[PDB]
Design a protein around this ligand. Structure first.
Ligand code: ACO
Ligand code: U3Y
Length: 153
């Protein structure tokens, strides 16, 4: 109600906006295959708009591993001047709502570079827990270590 934040679908018309947002927000680069895959995941990928300004995005994929159906969050973020306005919450609530409505997911997980204190704090507010610390997860960036954050459903 009265919200300045809206999510919209990712399409061949606005994929260039998603790529530009991910280039600015994340310290790693994603390939043509990641974006081609994003166009096929439907609701698992969304752009976030603040007053109709594309300022963030979320991209997920269904992961079948550990003999489970898992929702894997690949990228979730928003431009630095728009942080702490609820954009992250709106994107994460969208992914939790798909999982609740579907009912076949065992858990939802993601990787967070250990230096990202803000992202750990953000995810722990939604019931995600640090289940593992993977050493040398990132190839060319420092710190290379990543925490595995998971929420059980
Ligand atoms: C799968 C992945 O992509 S892992 C990497 C996650 N993304 C990134 O780190 C990219 C860069 N960071 C970001 O874009 C953002 O800072 C995000 C995604 C972590 C957070 O999204 P935001 O829009 O800023 O968060 P939002 O406003 O919805 O915050 C919700 C709550 O999280 C917590 N939180 C979020 N950021 C912080 C922070 N910097 N310090 C402390 N607590 C925080 C707070 O409790 C906050 O509630 P409040 O603002 O009412 O106090
Ligand atoms: C099969 N699908 C999976 O399950 C799966 C497994 S890895 C994966 C994807 C998503 C994963 N997301 C995160 O790591 C998030 C977002 C973010 O940007 N960061 C920093 C963060 O904190 N967490 C990164 N990854 C890469 O392709 C990727 C990994 C490392 C580098 C790199 N470049 N230089 N050194 N290493 C570049 C790209 N998907």
């Amino acid at each position: 109600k009265g919200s300045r934040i809206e999510l919209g679908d990712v399409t061949p018309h606005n994929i260039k906006q998603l790529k530009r947002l991910n280039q600015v927000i994340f310290p790693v680069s994603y390939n043509d295959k990641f974006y081609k895959d994003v166009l096929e995941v439907g609701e698992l990928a969304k752009l976030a708009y603040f007053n109709d300004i594309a300022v963030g995005a979320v991209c997920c994929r269904v992961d079948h591993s550990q003999n489970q159906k898992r929702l894997y969050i690949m990228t979730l973020g928003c431009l630095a001047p728009y942080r702490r306005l609820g954009i992250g919450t709106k994107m994460l609530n969208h992914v939790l709502n798909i999982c609740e409505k579907d009912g076949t997911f065992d858990n939802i997980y993601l990787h967070v570079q250990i230096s990202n204190e803000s992202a750990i704090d953000f995810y722990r507010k939604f019931g995600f827990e640090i289940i593992e610390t993977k050493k040398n997860y990132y190839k060319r960036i420092e710190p290379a270590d990543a925490h595995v954050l998971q929420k059980n459903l």
